Amino acid sequence: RVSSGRDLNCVPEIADTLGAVAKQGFDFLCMPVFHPRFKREFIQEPAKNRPGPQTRSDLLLSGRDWNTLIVGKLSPWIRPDSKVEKIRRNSEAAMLQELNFGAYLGLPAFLLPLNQEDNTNLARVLTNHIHTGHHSSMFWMRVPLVAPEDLRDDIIENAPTTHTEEYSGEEKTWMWWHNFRTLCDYSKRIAVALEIGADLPSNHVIDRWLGEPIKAAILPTSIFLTNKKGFPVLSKMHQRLIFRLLKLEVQFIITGTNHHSCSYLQYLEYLSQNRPPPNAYELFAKGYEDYLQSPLQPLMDNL
Amino acid sequence: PPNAPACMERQLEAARYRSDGALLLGASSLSGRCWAGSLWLFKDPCAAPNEGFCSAGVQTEAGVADLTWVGERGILVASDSGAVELWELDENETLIVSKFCKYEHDDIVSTVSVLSSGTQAVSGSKDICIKVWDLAQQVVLSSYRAHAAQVTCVAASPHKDSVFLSCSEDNRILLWDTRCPKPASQIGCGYLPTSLAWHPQQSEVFVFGDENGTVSLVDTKSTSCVLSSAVHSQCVTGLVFSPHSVPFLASLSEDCSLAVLDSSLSELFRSQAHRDFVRDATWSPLNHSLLTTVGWDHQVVHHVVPT
Amino acid sequence: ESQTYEVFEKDPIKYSQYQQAIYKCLLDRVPEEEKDTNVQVLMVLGAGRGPLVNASLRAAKQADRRIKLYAVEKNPNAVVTLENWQFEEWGSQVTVVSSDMREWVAPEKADIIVSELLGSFADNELSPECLDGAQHFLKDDGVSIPGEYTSFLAPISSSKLYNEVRACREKDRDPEAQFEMPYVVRLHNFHQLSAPQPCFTFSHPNRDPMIDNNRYCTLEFPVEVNTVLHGFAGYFETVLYQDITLSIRPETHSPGMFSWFPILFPIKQPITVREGQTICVRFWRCSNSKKVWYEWAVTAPVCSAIHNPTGRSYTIGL
Amino acid sequence: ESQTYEVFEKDPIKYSQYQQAIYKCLLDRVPEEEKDTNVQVLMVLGAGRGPLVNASLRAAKQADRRIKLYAVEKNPNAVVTLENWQFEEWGSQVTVVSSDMREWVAPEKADIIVSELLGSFADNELSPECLDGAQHFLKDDGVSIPGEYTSFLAPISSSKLYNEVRACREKDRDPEAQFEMPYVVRLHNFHQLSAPQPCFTFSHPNRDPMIDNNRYCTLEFPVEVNTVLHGFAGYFETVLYQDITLSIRPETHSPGMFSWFPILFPIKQPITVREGQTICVRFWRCSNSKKVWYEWAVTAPVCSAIHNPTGRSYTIGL
Ligand SMILES: Cc1ncnc2c1ccn2[C@@H]1C[C@H](Oc2cc(C(F)F)c(F)c3c2CNCC3)[C@@H](O)[C@H]1O
Ligand SMILES: Cc1ncnc2c1ccn2[C@@H]1C[C@H](Oc2cc(C(F)F)c(F)c3c2CNCC3)[C@@H](O)[C@H]1O
């Protein structure tokens, strides 16, 4: 009933990992296509000439599995907007390399992060790859509801967390997304993977994501509260947000390590089962949602 | 060749000499079918990396991103799986056995540092958190989300058990002290901090390397008049001081080089023996002018620093 | 893509044919007495995920000779599959080279260069250009597999495929560009008006200076029926080694071969052909330093416009 | 064309400036005692109908030194004018070479390579690439004239030029392509919103390995007035030799120079700028083996789409 996917950053054996992920009950896996720690060099000798394979083989999975179950993840060291020229040049080559590898496999979607205000060069390199070749892969922007800098523990003695309401300030992650898609010319191939943190922001901040192409929601294990029996659950505020996303029919993604004695998935299924039944209108319109049709002209035309 | 693996993964992550002179090796396969890791002990440092000429070996279920000695028998491992691992040598030092594998971080544990006493340790992850551990109790004492990005380096105080340094992609260098209610403080002073090194004599002075190859000398007292040198062309992956009463600073980098510098940061040694990224440095406890470096090229190169 | 290579791999007939072409060449180059004295330098050019590399090893076992394999591939995504195979199975035998075959400076010259750079109209993937830039690293007596290839052309009638091409109009381009570019198609509901005739032929190695891969060919096709010409089906034949060959020409089609389907070269306006009339077509192979393309025109019974003048609608990149 | 070269020739200021750059270099390279011992190898790269060749001869007379001139031109129509001049007037002095400066294998190395391969945005005619491929035939101590060049950019408002670009829509192409390509224009009814700032700079020779002519520059332009931004005027400055320079930057414009007019880099949708706001623009110099192009975007006060992504609307051919 819920299209759910497991997010991993550690995959030692791809077939074992996928087998366990599917045993858990997930419909897809988000995993790195190269080793997240395997930083590569493209400009200077001798690390430029690093021999041996660059990643694991495409032969390790059926084309059908690469096509339907694997979601690629950009490498965390790739920073096209670094203040260091060499890191931008190297990151440009590595991003195109990683994207073109996922296109070579026909992966249904690839993930890219939005975690700083300036993502100009990342957008230019994405736009450039879109205009290069024949691929049709969906691009997911991993963007948080709240920036890591605004949900940090108030434990820096000489740098404290402000308690003053900054209206526009609290909705900074939406402008990171807005600028990225304005740069990328509103491409239909670029969507949002909205990351939901520990404590929900103001309602206005959540309402900024209304009308936006949210294709997935990322729920870290650390945002789950424990019930009386010991299994993971979510707050009524967090639950409300899940019900909004289920109408939008997003793909739920579970990220992070385990923290409870899969139950994380089973809670979403339970919530999805408990939602209100669709009324006459909602049942009739089921399929017609945001589908543009021409207004009838029964005077001019014969119905 | 004991009751352990027959092959050691090409990417040599960490080289650590213990008190007697035995060499610790951390390795991971960052390419190919399997992406797992391994731990190795070489009682003969000249026999490394030859898998058949070793004292003991072991297979980790995932890559080794960082490691540290927990005395003379124990070994603390930063895993890609998000686990902090403690592996202890057996009674004969012919086996490496798992003591604890604790999955408490939500992403790749990138850095690990054992605290002055040796009963506690600090881990820094890509999940942005920093954690203080009880090695004996096998739990996390405190969890700290003080950063706004991935933690690059965690370095425990040479002598104070409550103090440590952390640096991150959020451009912060945080001085910690668990005795305060707000444990961290931002060291004032550009480019992202990548490597941290506490000075072994002045418990108030430390060095930091940045993503632009520059190495800088910092005094916690008057955080101005900072001494700096452009040592490397690429990012500085590590800084290790020599055991000498007046230590020498060895700096490893992504430019595939090693350099040994004096107290005024000037260059005295330079080594291009490495063809891939230089990942670690460990000075011999026995021969203080002899320094070892392991790289991503599978080399274990032994250097004789001109002192 | 990975699946495109998977599809090309699942063609046994073509690889059992390549196997034999190497087998017969291994015997002709190394006599039974020289069985262990001489190891043959074999160079796969455009190796993909290595189906020819494996065929070369299967050919070396049955011919019972020694080979030194090189697997040159420019696609670095394919090169990952090759390097994983080299580590897990092939070994020192195969030296995987991640380069463009016209840029690679080779250690030593090759005894045999083996390539599959052929499309539905033979030279339409730029096999002439690729193997020309690779020819400098072939021994002054080396063998190229394939040694020769020829494109064929036949006039066709299909008001169904003419409509299918009309439907290919796209915005922001010439409203008639869809008629000035070839298409790969499994031709079905159509009529062949004259027998296929050879168009362009290329042989490797090309020891001649001022080699020139440009072409101009005039074909005269006798028509026995009354009809409406809409285009020209193109096929190819190739001589791998001696009698070992592959063909997609329907009257000599290699049985069970999947890798190629006919090309179709359409014409803007359909042409009426009466019984006894001759359809005359002109084809050109053109090129500059950066692009190769085809241009073509019907000159009998009536003239057409010159199709794709200067690759304006379709060029093949160098 | 012949008349384009005639127009470029009728610019005295630019040639009297080139004259002096050669004059001062001749003195710095050959001391008065060496006056007749050393003849300097001078190589004009992209000679046209030879206005620089004549300037080089005028510079050799006033500097009273010996020169050995070469006039490299790829345009063979221009090469006819050069070869007629060589016969009727220049003589043995000038060795006319009808080649592309990146393909020419020179007899000996050059003392000075002199070129005019600059456009309104400096490196927009591919001067970086041309002189890089010619750099191998320059002495390990030779002088390139020009030694350096820099492109400048200034934000502008002109609802009149924004309309002029809208009017540039053509059929069979992107309805918005006219906004993703530069234009050479004598800007008149317009308003400059911020002072010109340097964008891209190239120096010759480029002795550095992994030389890379690609660029990415971020500019922050302070605006004092309320306005509507429509595009970016581009200009250039060049250091011929030492203090001898040419400029089209309005605040340092070389008086009486005709050969260049400003470029204009438009934006699809006009942008409102309030007094005190900063206009931030990003420029890129891009390239593959065959084409070089610019891509650009406004990032403040608001974002624009990335203009000309992958040279899709405009590329400069290699
Ligand atoms: C200048 C240069 N230098 C190095 N390699 C180059 C080039 C140009 C192309 N190529 C390679 C050739 C290779 O083409 C194939 C591979 C397989 C096999 F892999 F299955 C095939 F079945 C088929 C083809 C193509 N014709 C249909 C059957 C493809 O991988 C390209 O990247
Ligand atoms: C790779 C290569 N190899 C050999 N020559 C090459 C190239 C590329 C271009 N060219 C030449 C350069 C030359 O450009 C000029 C000549 C005159 C003078 F003739 F008046 C000018 F005033 C001006 C220009 C151009 N900037 C404005 C002023 C033109 O003739 C081209 O054919």
Domains of chain C are 2-145 (3.40.50.150), 148-317 (2.70.160.11)
The contacts of residue B137 (CB under 8 Å, 6+ apart) are none
Q: Note whether B30 and B279 are within 8 A (CB).
A: no
The one-letter code for the residue type at A51 is P
Measured distance CA(A4)–CA(A251) in Å, rounded: 6
Q: D78-85 vs D2-9: helix axis angle to the nearest 10?
A: 60
Tell me the pairing of strands D244-247 and D263-273. unpaired
Looking only at Cα atoms, what is the longest distance across chain D?
67
* Structural domain range at position B231: 1-307
Q: Check residue D240 and give left, alpha or beta (phi > 0: left; psi -120 to 50: alpha).
A: alpha
Number of H helices, E strands in chain C: 6, 16
Pairing assessment for the beta strands D39-45 and D66-72 based on DSSP bridges: parallel
Q: Are the beta carbons of B248 and B241 closer than 8 angstroms?
A: yes
* Residues with C-beta less than 6 Å from any ligand 1 atom: C 5, 8-9, 46, 48-49, 51, 72-75, 78, 100-102, 116-118, 125, 130, 259
For ligand 2, the distance from its centroid to the CA atom of residue D117, given in whole angstroms, is 5
Are β-strands C291-300 and D148-157 bridged in parallel, bridged antiparallel, or unpaired? Answer: unpaired
Q: Classify B6 as helix, strand or coil.
A: coil
Instruction: Say how far apart CA B212 and CA B193 lie, in whole Å.
Output: 9
Strand partners, B120: B134
Distances (CA, A) of C256 to A250, C52, C160, D61, D279: 46, 18, 27, 79, 65
How many Å is the maximal CA-CA distance in chain C?
67
The answer to whether B299 and B273 have CB atoms below 8 angstroms apart is yes
Nearest CA to ligand 1 atom 2: C100
Active-site positions of D read 116, 125
The range of the structural domain enclosing residue A204 comes to: 4-293
Residues of chain C that touch chain D, judged by Cβ-Cβ distance less than 8 Å? 172-175, 290
Euclidean distance between CA atoms D63 and D125, whole angstroms: 31
Closest CA to C246 of C130, C128, C145, C316: C145
Residue with tokens 């019900």: A243
Q: Which among D13, D74, D126 is the best mutation to test ligand 2's pocket, defined by most ligand atoms within 8 Å of the CB? A: D74
CB burial of residue A245 (10 Å; 0-12, 13-18, 19+): buried
- Residue C193 parent element (H or E): none
Does a structural domain hold residue A8?
yes
Domain count, chain A: 1
Per CB-CB distance under 8 Å, the chain C contacts of D174 are: 172
**Separation of alpha carbons C155 and C281, rounded Å:** 9
In a domain, A298, yes or no: no
Whether B129 contacts B105, CB under 8 Å: yes
Token pair for residue B206?
């430390």
* Cα angle value C80/C82/C83 (rounded, 5°): 65
Of the candidates D178, D181, D185, the one whose C-alpha atom is nearest the C-alpha of residue D158 is D185
Rounded to 5 degrees, φ, ψ at B91 are: -55, -35
Beta carbons of A63 and C6 less than 8 Å apart: yes
Q: Pairing mode, if any, of strands D39-45 and D110-115? A: parallel
Task: Let me know if C129 is a catalytic residue.
Answer: no
Helix residue spans in A196-262 (DSSP H): 203-207, 236-247
Query: Phi and psi (nearest 5°) for C92?
Result: -50, -30
Closest-CA residue to D153 (of D268, D296, D254, D309):
D296
Q: How many other β-carbons are positioned within 10 Å of the β-carbon of residue D235?
A: 26
Contact B30, A38 (CB under 8 A): yes
Q: Using CB atoms within 10 A of its CB, is residue A134 exposed (0-12), middle (13-18) or buried (19+)?
A: exposed
Tokens read off for D48: 């046209």
Cβ-defined contact of C1 to A100 (cutoff 8 Å): no
- Residue B261 DSSP symbol: E
Q: Distance between CA atoms of A161 and A145, rounded to whole angstroms?
A: 17
Q: Are A172 and A205 in contact (CB under 8 A)?
A: no
d(CA C49, ligand 1 centre) in Å:
9
For residue A141, being part of any structural domain is answered with: yes
How far does the centroid of ligand 2 lie from the alpha carbon of residue D118, in Å? Answer: 8
- Is A283 a domain residue? yes
Answer whether A144's CB lies under 8 Å from A197's CB: yes
Angle between helix A120-130 and A85-104 (nearest 10): 30
Alpha-carbon distance of D34 to D27, in angstroms, equals 11
Chain-chain contact of A124 with D306 (C-beta, under 8 angstroms)? yes
> Which tokens in the block code for residue C153?
């052309």
Residue D212: CB atoms within 10 A of its CB come to: 13
Using CA atoms, how far apart are residues A208 and A228, in angstroms rounded to an integer?
35
Buried b (16+ CB within 10 A) or exposed e, A54-67: bbbbbeebebeebe
Q: Is A301 among the domain residues?
A: no
Does residue B34 belong to the interface with chain C, where contact is any CB pair within 8 Å? no
Nearest CA in chain D to A182: D305
Residue A222 lies in a domain: yes
Kindly report the protein residue whose alpha carbon is nearest to atom 12 of ligand 2: D46
The angle, 0 to 180 degrees and rounded to 10, between the axes of the packed helices A236-247 and A263-274 is: 70
Q: Does D269 touch chain A (CB under 8 A)?
A: no
- State the catalytic residue, choosing from C9, C83, C125, C129: C125
Helical pair D12-29 and D51-62, crossing angle rounded to 10 deg? 50
The tokens for C141 are: 């007596």
Examine residue A200 and state whether it is found in any structural domain, yes or no: yes
Residue pair B271/A60 in contact by the 8 Å Cβ criterion: no
Pairing label, strands A214-220, A190-195: parallel
Sequence ranges of the binding site of D for a protein: 8, 116, 125
Q: Which of A90, A40, A48, A87 is nearest to B211 (CA)?
A: A87
Q: Which residues of D touch A178 (CB under 8 A)?
A: 303
Q: Tell me the two tokens of residue D260.
A: 């260049």
Domain count, chain B: 1
Mutate to test the pocket of ligand 1, among C8, C82, C127 (most ligand atoms within 8 A of CB): C8
Is residue C130 helix, strand or coil?
helix
Mapping DSSP onto H, E and C, the string for chain D reads: CHHHHHHHHCCHHHHHHHHHHHHHHHHHHCCHHHCCCCEEEEEEECCCCCHHHHHHHHHHHHCCCEEEEEEECCCCCHHHHHHHHHHHHHHHHEEEECCCCCCCCCCCCEEEEEECCCECCEHHHCHHHHHHHHHHHEEEEEEEECCEEEEEEEEEECHHHHHHHHCCCCCCCCCCHHHCCCEECCCCCCEECCCCEEEEEEECCCCCCCCCCCEEEEEEEECCCCEEEEEEEEEEEEEEECCEEEECCHHHCCCCCCCCCCEEEEEEEEEEECCCCEEEEEEEEEECCCEEEEEEEEEECCCCCCECHHHCCCCEEC
User: Which ligand has the minimum distance to the alpha carbon of residue C10?
Assistant: 1
Neighbours of A150 (CB within 10 A): 17
How far apart (Å, rounded) are the C-alpha atoms in residues A211 and A189?
Answer: 16
Report whether A200 contacts A238 (CB < 8 A): yes
Is residue C108 within 8 Å of C41, Cβ to Cβ?
A: yes
Taking every pair of Cα atoms in chain A, the longest distance, rounded to a whole number of angstroms, is: 76
Ligand 2 atom with minimal separation from the D126 CA: 8
Residues 6+ apart with CB under 8 A from C92: none
Task: Report yes or no: B64 and B77 within 8 Å, Cβ to Cβ.
Answer: yes
Look up residue C122 and give its DSSP letter: B
How far apart, in whole angstroms, are the C-alpha atoms of residue D71 and residue D50?
7
Strand stretches in C159-225, DSSP E: 183-184, 191-192, 197-203, 215-222
- Cα torsion D96, D102, D104, D107: sign: positive
Rounded-to-integer distance, Cα A87 and Cα A40, Å:
11
Which are the contacts of C69, defined by CB distance < 8 A and separation ≥ 6?
A: C42, C43, C44, C53, C56, C57, C90, C93, C94, C95
- What CATH number is given to the structural domain containing A245? 3.20.20.150
Q: C290 contacts in D (CB within 8 Å)?
A: 290
Way it was determined: X-ray
Q: Which residues of C touch A54 (CB under 8 A)?
A: 76, 80, 83
Final resolution, Å: 2.5
Q: What's the D290 CA to ligand 1 centre distance in angstroms?
A: 21
User: What DSSP character marks residue B45?
Assistant: G
Task: Kindly provide the b/e burial profile for residues B12-21, where b requires at least 16 CB atoms within 10 angstroms of the residue's own CB.
Answer: bbbbbbbeee
Give the side-chain half-sphere CA count within 13 A for B117.
Answer: 11
CB atoms within 10 A of CB C54: 20
Q: How far apart are CA B185 and CA A50, in angstroms?
A: 40
Distance, CA of B154 to CA of B164 (rounded, Å)? 7
For the sheet with B64-70, list strands across it.
Answer: B64-70, B74-79, B83-89, B96-103
Dihedral of CA atoms B10, B16, B19, B20 in degrees, nearest 10, equals: 20
